[model samples]
Target: KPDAPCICTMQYDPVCGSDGITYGNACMLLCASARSDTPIELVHKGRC
Candidate 1:
């Protein structure tokens, strides 16, 4: 699932930066599952 915007922006991991690059990247992938109509372009971009 796409993480709540608040969690996406929050600093949770002690090692990862505030941006939560790891979580953010994983969340981006999960975003594909949540959206009923995620754009094709976005899905392609997400893979990259």
Candidate 2:
């Protein structure tokens, strides 16, 4: 992958990833997919 570092804010808008993990926000979710082993996907727009 050409991406490694992730820039995310300290926001709290949680999002559910494909691996059933709760992200801090959409930005954090975007960051997760960049490095997560499971290629995190946005399963929903809120905390799982």
Candidate 3:
């Protein structure tokens, strides 16, 4: 299992996932991606 932070602060570090949705940060994106069967790639490091 991948170890992720217990809590993620509200940061502006946005990221675009393959699901075509913008995530608040890498931690949030990774956390969501991990739970999904489809793979999510970091389209960019800023807001989509």
Candidate 4:
């Protein structure tokens, strides 16, 4: 099944994924990584 809407507050929790893209927050990263074929990792807790 597809992921539901992500309910995340306005926070700057940046994450760098294996996809080499920087997500705004963990929620966004999870949302994106879930839909992608390539697995993404939390390289760090800051912007890439």
Candidate 5:
């Protein structure tokens, strides 16, 4: 189940788009840009 293709869901009070993001089937939770401001990317793939 962990490796299964799952959908990432997101919800916001006020729906607003960011600088570099595209709204897919799921919510716009993932970082829009490859160049993220934070140390982490939109989707955390690696496991600790």
Candidate 6:
């Protein structure tokens, strides 16, 4: 488990971000939060 990353790993399990976007996975969402201003968070375990 992590909160920040750049070198992304791969997996298909989906997650919903706080910004109402469905990220590829939790890590991708965290990556977006790390790289962008949207402050993405794990909103749910599936698409929002």
Q: Residues 1-48, candidate 5: write the lDDT tens digits.
A: 112222354333222234233334223323332233432222321121
Q: Show model 6 residue runs off by greater than 4 Å.
A: 1-8
Q: What is the lDDT of residue 18 in candidate 4?
A: 69
User: How well is each residue in 11-47 modelled by candidate 4, as lDDT tens digits?
Assistant: 8677787677777777777677677666678787776
TM-score of 1: 0.24
What are the clashing pairs of model 1? none
Judged by TM-score relative to the true structure, which candidate is superior, 1 or 3? Answer: 3
Assess candidate 5 and give its TM-score to the true structure: 0.20
Best candidate (score: TM-score):
4
Positional deviation of residue 20's Cα in model 6 after best superposition, in angstroms = 0.8
**How many pairs collide in each candidate, listed in order?**
0, 0, 0, 0, 0, 0
Task: Please write out the lDDT profile of model 2 over residues 1-48, one tens digit for every residue.
Answer: 455444566667788888898888866766677766768778887877
Clashing pairs in 3: none
- Model 4, 39: alpha-carbon shift in Å? 1.8
Ranked candidates (TM-score, high to low):
4, 2, 6, 3, 1, 5
- The lowest-lDDT stretch of 10 consecutive residues in candidate 3 is 1-10
TM-score of each: 0.24, 0.66, 0.63, 0.66, 0.20, 0.65
lDDT of 3 by residue, 1-48 (tens): 574652587876778877776778878877767675666888877766
Better of 2 and 5 by lDDT: 2
Each model's C-alpha lDDT?
Answer: 0.32, 0.73, 0.72, 0.71, 0.30, 0.73
**1-48 per-residue lDDT for model 6 (tens digits):** 335874466676578878887777877777778776767677787877
Residue 23 accuracy (lDDT) in model 3: 73
True lDDT of residue 37, candidate 1: 45
RMSD in order of candidates: 9.4, 2.2, 2.3, 2.3, 10.7, 3.1
- The candidate with the higher TM-score, 4 or 6, is 4
